[PDB]
Design a binder for this molecule. Sequence first.
Ligand SMILES: *[C@@H]1O[C@H](CO)[C@@H](O[C@@H]2O[C@H](CO)[C@@H](O[C@@H]3O[C@H](CO[C@H]4O[C@H](CO)[C@@H](O)[C@H](O)[C@@H]4O)[C@@H](O)[C@H](O[C@H]4O[C@H](CO)[C@@H](O)[C@H](O)[C@@H]4O)[C@@H]3O)[C@H](O)[C@H]2NC(C)=O)[C@H](O)[C@H]1NC(C)=O
Ligand SMILES: *[C@@H]1O[C@H](CO)[C@@H](O[C@@H]2O[C@H](CO)[C@@H](O[C@@H]3O[C@H](CO[C@H]4O[C@H](CO)[C@@H](O)[C@H](O)[C@@H]4O)[C@@H](O)[C@H](O[C@H]4O[C@H](CO)[C@@H](O)[C@H](O)[C@@H]4O)[C@@H]3O)[C@H](O)[C@H]2NC(C)=O)[C@H](O)[C@H]1NC(C)=O
Lengths: 131, 132, 211, 208
Amino acid sequence: FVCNTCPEKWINFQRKCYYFGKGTKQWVHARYACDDMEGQLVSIHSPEEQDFLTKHASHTGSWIGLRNLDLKGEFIWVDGSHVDYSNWAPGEPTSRSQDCVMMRGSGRWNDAFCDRKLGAWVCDRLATCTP
Amino acid sequence: FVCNTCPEKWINFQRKCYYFGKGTKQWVHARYACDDMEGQLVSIHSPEEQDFLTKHASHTGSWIGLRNLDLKGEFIWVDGSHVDYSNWAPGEPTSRSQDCVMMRGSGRWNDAFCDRKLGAWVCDRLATCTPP
Amino acid sequence: GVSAYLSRPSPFDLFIRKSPTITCLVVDLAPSKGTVQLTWSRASGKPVQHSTRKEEKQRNGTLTVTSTLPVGTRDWIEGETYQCRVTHPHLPRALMRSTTKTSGPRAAPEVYAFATPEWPGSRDKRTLACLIQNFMPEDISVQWLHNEVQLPDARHSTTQPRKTKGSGFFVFSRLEVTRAEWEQKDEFICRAVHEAASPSQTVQRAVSVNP
Amino acid sequence: VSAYLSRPSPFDLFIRKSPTITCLVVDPSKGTVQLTWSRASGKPVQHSTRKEEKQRNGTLTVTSTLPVGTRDWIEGETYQCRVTHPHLPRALMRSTTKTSGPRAAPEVYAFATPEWPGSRDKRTLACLIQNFMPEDISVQWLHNEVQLPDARHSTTQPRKTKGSGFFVFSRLEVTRAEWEQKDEFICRAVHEAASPSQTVQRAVSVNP
Ligand SMILES: *[C@@H]1O[C@H](CO)[C@@H](O[C@@H]2O[C@H](CO)[C@@H](O[C@@H]3O[C@H](CO[C@H]4O[C@H](CO)[C@@H](O)[C@H](O)[C@@H]4O)[C@@H](O)[C@H](O[C@H]4O[C@H](CO)[C@@H](O)[C@H](O)[C@@H]4O)[C@@H]3O)[C@H](O)[C@H]2NC(C)=O)[C@H](O)[C@H]1NC(C)=O
Ligand SMILES: *[C@@H]1O[C@H](CO)[C@@H](O[C@@H]2O[C@H](CO)[C@@H](O[C@@H]3O[C@H](CO[C@H]4O[C@H](CO)[C@@H](O)[C@H](O)[C@@H]4O)[C@@H](O)[C@H](O[C@H]4O[C@H](CO)[C@@H](O)[C@H](O)[C@@H]4O)[C@@H]3O)[C@H](O)[C@H]2NC(C)=O)[C@H](O)[C@H]1NC(C)=O
């Protein structure tokens, strides 16, 4: 069984498939948009996955699936898994507040306010297997 | 020298002159009305003075010149003089609001709120003397 | 005349109880026939959970109607905007109110509890005061405890959040206590639930009547 | 457009002996927002000071401060304020007079906060003034027997108690140089029913 089949307007990479959406949306509105497309906000756990995303991501700025429940204090992905691999920008994670994570055109991660309106977001779902 | 001459609509008694006004007015508005008539709110210092007032006062209720600066808490007349003679009603002076003084139809004094609207007030001024 | 107000959920209901609720209060100073009608909508366009409408006629002669809408814990914290449309038949314009999470800097609150001495004529009753200061944003939950169990909300009075000389906010809490209360247990806890409070959104201080 | 008419502070009424009532009108097109002053008596009024300032949010704020008589206010005189504007449809009227009802002396209690980590050279002083009626009260802070500026402290709005009285809280931040000079801070309260001479005060000390 091979996992490579992916839907229309989505791009394949490894055991996942990825969608790169365009339009003015907040972090929460991007999360709802991913659920509407039968997926969730992108979760990065390997440097190979990050490298693929940088090649297709918006040069302006994109939203990712990393956040904190505020009750926790530590960053936890939308799927539930903890942070094992971290590609933070110099000085990040910023403690200006004490928040959400966005991906720059360079591929580095930076802390941003949830109400901030970005023109890009990345959706992710598991790739369907072939007999 | 004799002090008995008094103006029109005013009544004479001893060395003073007295006016008995009719109309809806608060304690402060009665005080201003007294000044407008070249007098001041009534000041009682003798039982003879009180006896004359009861005979001419309104049966409903009238305003007098007794008050307190709030800073004192002590009752002092509008002219400035202290209380020597007291004709308070049973229980009065009350400490309900811990106020101003009004005269009943009976002649006795009772505490009342300043904003209370009464239909009567008493003005008083020194009677003009006549040549010897 | 008419006015509409839309509230945010209390940090106790948001962080501790894990069931947050937002209330839309509409004070109709000239009640009339028909009804007001309170529409609920999200900025996303997604459906809303069932709201509880509560209409009471006050002693002054005004109708007070409150619609308490339940919201998602993760949905509120993540920055979802909740809108409320109010449409009276005796009104030209439809009043719209919108509320969302206050996105800005964070500061942990500083709790200080105090006990008043015995005043002449007041022996069987004493007053307990609490100062909860330097915290941001303004949203805070102030609670009083006796025998490790919470005291009713009507028993105490908490001030509106006012800005401090620095950057934070300050709130005062007043709780009157009976002789039977301090004699059973001479300890009164003042709890404070806040967004930035650590650990687990709780900052509290104990106080005693004559220790 | 909204209009508000205030009462004088017990400090200006009882201590300073020069009370003043302010009419605040929060609007701003042709800002000829005239403020007429009149007594219920009809007697003339003393000269009012008009103060118009344009706020950062884009609204014009105009205040008219009218001086009133100490004996005239206490005795129950009603002071009226007529507000007129060209774009306004009907003239707004506001009236204020002395709150005539029961009296209660305030209960003053002062407190000092302990040292908080990161806050050594600065401490916070709190004071609770309770069980007084009517709601009008003047709260002041003193150091070295002389009064401190009003901007230095913050006093809460009068809220009702569980009984009959009212309560107010006062917050004052103090520097290290202040307590080291003299370790005594007085909390003065000026109220209608306060005895003797409208003054009720309590002293507090940073680490006594
Ligand atoms: C007839 O009598 C009734 C009372 O019986 C009066 O009704 C009150 O009216 C005022 C003003 O309209 C109401 O005050 C407002 O309350 C809002 C909500 O407060 C609480 O709401 C819930 C409690 O269920 C809590 O979750 C929440 O945390 C609050 O504790 C506030 O949001 C309002 O504030 C806004 O307006 C003020 C200015 O008015 C601004 O300064 C603020 O910044 C803010 O924008 C406001 O304080 C009050 O709640 C009403 N009482 C009741 C019981 O409903 C009538 O007004 C009165 N009629 C007349 C003619 O006087
Ligand atoms: C643009 O920004 C400005 C501020 O820069 C805002 O203006 C404020 O507006 C509010 C509401 O209109 C004003 O609040 C009112 O203040 C009155 C007076 O308070 C003090 O007045 C003098 C100080 O000079 C003192 O002598 C006095 O003791 C007070 O300390 C109050 O009387 C008002 O309260 C009335 O309503 C409440 C219910 O809401 C009742 O409980 C009261 O009994 C009373 O009837 C009120 O609180 C405030 O003063 C204004 N600020 C300034 C600096 O003028 C604008 O509103 C803002 N624009 C927008 C669109 O938000």
